[PDB]
Write a protein that binds this DNA or RNA. Sequence first.
RNA 1: GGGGCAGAAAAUUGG
RNA 2: GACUUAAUGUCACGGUACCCAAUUUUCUGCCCCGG
Length: 1271
Amino acid sequence: DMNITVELTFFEPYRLVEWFDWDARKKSHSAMRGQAFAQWTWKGKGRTAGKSFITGTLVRSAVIKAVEELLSLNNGKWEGVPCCNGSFQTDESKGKKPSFLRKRHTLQWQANNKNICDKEEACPFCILLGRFDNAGKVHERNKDYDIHFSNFDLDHKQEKNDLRLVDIASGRILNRVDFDTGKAKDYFRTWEADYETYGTYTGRITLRNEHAKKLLLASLGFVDKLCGALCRIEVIKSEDHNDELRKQAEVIVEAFKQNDKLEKIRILADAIRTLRLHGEGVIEKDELPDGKEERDKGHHLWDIKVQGTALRTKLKELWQSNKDIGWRKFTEMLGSNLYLIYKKETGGVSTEYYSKSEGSDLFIPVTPPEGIETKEWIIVGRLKAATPFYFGVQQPSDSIPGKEKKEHTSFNILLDKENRYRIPRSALRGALRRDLRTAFGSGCNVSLGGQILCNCKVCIEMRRITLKDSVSDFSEPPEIRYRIAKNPGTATVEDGSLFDIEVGPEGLTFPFVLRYRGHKFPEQLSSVIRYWEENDGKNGMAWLGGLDSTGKGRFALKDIKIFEWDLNQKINEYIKERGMRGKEKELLEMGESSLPDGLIPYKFFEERECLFPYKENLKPQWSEVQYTIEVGSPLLTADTISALTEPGNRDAIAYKKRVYNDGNNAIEPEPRFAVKSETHRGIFRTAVGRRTGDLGKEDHEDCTCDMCIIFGNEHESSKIRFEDLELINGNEFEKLEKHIDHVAIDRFTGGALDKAKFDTYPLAGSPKKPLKLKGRFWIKKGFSGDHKLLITTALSDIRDGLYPLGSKGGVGYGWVAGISIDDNVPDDFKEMINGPINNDYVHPGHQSPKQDHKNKNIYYPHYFLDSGSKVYREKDIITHEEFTEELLSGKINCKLETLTPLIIPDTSDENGLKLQGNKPGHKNYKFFNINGELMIPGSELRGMLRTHFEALTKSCFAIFGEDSTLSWCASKTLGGKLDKALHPCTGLSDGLCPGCHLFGTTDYKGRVKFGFAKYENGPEWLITRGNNPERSLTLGVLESPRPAFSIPDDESEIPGRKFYLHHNGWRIIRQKQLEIRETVQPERNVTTEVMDKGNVFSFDVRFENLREWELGLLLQSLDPGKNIAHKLGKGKPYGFGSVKIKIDSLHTFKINSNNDKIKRVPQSDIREYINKGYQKLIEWSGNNSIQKGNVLPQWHVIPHIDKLYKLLWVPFLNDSKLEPDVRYPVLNEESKGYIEGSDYTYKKLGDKDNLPYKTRVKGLTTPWSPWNPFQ
RNA sequence: GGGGCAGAAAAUUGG
RNA sequence: GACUUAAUGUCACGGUACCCAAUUUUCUGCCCCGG
Ligand SMILES: [Zn+2]
Ligand SMILES: [Zn+2]
Ligand SMILES: [Zn+2]
Ligand SMILES: [Zn+2]
């Protein structure tokens, strides 16, 4: 007769739905799906506020199910009073159906009450159902209910105004994933509610019969789930901030637009988001990277003036203005506001199925056997991330709960309201369903519109499993990972291809709870649990999440404890302890002597080698290939966003990870260097696609090609999964990172271009101290022999060195020196994976000035090569998408010998040896070295051979600064004084010159790759006696080239390329070291280490898809003959750096032949290649009067080749007793170092009356012409 | 009598 | 006590936001005549 006040509390995020009564419910789909949830009603107009509740019929149905199970446990009795089976059928002619219909099994027992229930006397089950009362199916007064359930209202703790929907709920999209294809079929939305603040409901139950109070009070403690969440039932006795950020973002955007730097703004946007990982101290202690020393403009982005002041001080005042919103939200909103303002001021703004009627209404009774036992098993443990993980979520401003009717980061991660990482229940349940279907061998696809319960084994085992959601104890921000796609025809970045993913740290831990209520513990669930866990030898194989092909989401299970609860003897202890729901964290730390009564540990849990679904169905599913790459070159996988926000002021730095630690709950102090999984996934995919030839297809829609089978497409998932490549020997290095700076050289002036100096910071790789990267990839069961052969072929192509890792591969960065395969790799994979060339061409030098002399003449140190104006441009560009049969591909092994001393400085250390303490401002350097090994960079060799190849084949001026203007006023810039055909190639529509076709442009990758040269043998360190280091030399003063001497007199044109002369002018510099160290300021000259003549260096050149004449011209540009050499390094006017390259070996390979391999290519074939190049030069010339035949080619019949080989002629080589005297003039006598009667000043040469302008230009164009008697 | 350049140009998402 | 349930019948713990894409292409740390 007396009321019972009931409080239900949630321990999991529950579900919400809108309220429609009964007739408006059939119009909407979300409410018909959303029964057995919690309900939300709007209070007042405007669709903003309301209240949530839980209906009494839902709690009544839960209590009815609990009473049915509790009576089925004790065989139709409860504390001595027996009950009948009840009634669950309603005839259609007498009365109406009760507004909710049952599709599940009804548990029944043997009715031993020996009496039929009527209105006068009844069993507890019949008075708890409410069969014999005065109320039914149409409401009347609240009396004449024998048992009444009221509605359950939300216990708001503080009395306030109405509660909003956006403070209680959050929207989410769930999925249904097909098992055969791995792609989604349909999706549906839901609302999830918080349980920490809004998870308590209170209601009333009225019972007017003191015969079923004990069954009701026992059944209230047996209810386990309600509204999609674990529960416990007990009996009691901002817009101003967005706008203020928007106006300041507009201020910064107009400030960058005033300086014509709008395209930087987008990059700055990402930098602001990256500032959420650092502290506020990076704006407070000003740890942003500073500019160069003695520069007016500092950092190129942190010192851009915003309304009069710098950017860092502007961010300081902007954070002092909005310190009240926190650092993380301020950085996120400032980034996601700069993104929108950049998107507006540019000009361009940035299958839903719910389940289902009339017919097939049945009643299915189920009676268990009388002897059977029922138990409940509980498995507790921790889940650990062995890789970065990703749980996908839709964007904010689309996941608003009320406004469902229908940016900067493309893909976000799922987080809690306190910014904690969350493994949802749906992902764990889907992964358990997938692994259980794999373990059983067979299963069904999940049918949604259902009238009969499914009878497959997976569904029977999954209707007895209860899980629980997980949240970590970690609230630090995620990491952004970027991804591009490559255009396979040009080997550059495709248009509209950059996107970004948010990933979490590896090593994080989550709680894990599983429950099973049944008669015996299955072998298949034991197999899945043993498959998911890790031990010694075995690693975990629990794939949760949504980037599995790139290796994201592999978890392991540790600290597993399994407990058992008996229900036929210890049911009251289960009801009293509430199944330990919400107290499972205490069970991991509980001892054996503190367990509650009735809960024992489980001892017959079968081991890994005794389970039959394991090792037959689950273990052969994914196979592991683990290997180790040895890289003997610098390795640069650029970041370009983290380079902006760290101190050092560098352009491109390497890639780092953040690994989380479990023993100490911090992250880690030191990061881990790595190559991403997407990178070597793309390397494998590009290798397989270029071998088979499937990269040339225009579309892969409904494709069953080999690449789409191995690597997946839109309609199928991938059969191979790739993990990261981690550095494993980083503690063997001192100064692991190396600073390498690069420059571009103008083809006319010979000096450095404006705004073309840059720095790279790769990891220090050497041929005697290589980097070691350990990596792993997973392969699936069901691969054929052809596809395994393709994977083995891709690994062999990576090992042979065709695909370099990282960036700047054409100048020698990231060249793979070797690959090793571990011993635990499958055996079929181990079976599958495991003289001197001369030119003899003597060039006749300039006979008239030089060879008839006793060295009494002075020449000019640089001359100009003047070709015509026509450049041959090809519009059929050779593509990078396959290896063609008629073209050539291979490698050249070459050597390098010094004829004159060589200076290659190491500009990472400005102090170098010493000597800035004694004389300050003096720059002194060492030779180039990585880990103490003398090297020449591949960029210098590439630039030297590129300048030679461009001057040989009459191509365009590739690097040429056209904004410079002359003064003696000038008519125009010197870009206007060049012909339009020698201008650099822009775009592929007009075509490409030969130099841009072989070496590349911005929109076309090159087809030649130069490597780092290593020291082999010879006498090093030219020794001078009076010098503070003996291996050292103080150079003369050298400053910028003046184009006013080459083109005076405005009606004059640019006289072609600039080349230097070979002479032994360093012996003047050596003997006068004392006269240079004094009487010259120490801030003008430089001191460097020098190498002597006779040293040998070794390097390699790779090439792919070259024609025959291109290879002939390349082998001619490398070794152009006897008495012709090259020029390399510093001090080229003073004579330094004369090198000779000799070809040692040539190898060619053909991949289209199945069994063929690398070759040796004897001297007849390469002579044929040289002749095929010479015939192409003759055909480009136009003079077809020269005959054809098998003669050794005379290269000096073409005029510009004759001028080029007169510019590069070595006069002192094979004991010919002559040495020229090449030096600059002396600028207006009474100047230092002037001969008595030479008359070699600039005053005499720069007058009009003696040496007019045309004779001066003609003397700067004719090679080796004299200048002191002047011709 | 004196030092310069010290990053520039694309892609910032589509099926 | 309304807003806000119907009582002899609620498998929604009946459904993984899933699938596809190499942060990359090009560049000699170089260099003389006048304010
Ligand atoms: Zn009864
Ligand atoms: Zn099924
Ligand atoms: Zn295909
Ligand atoms: Zn060109």
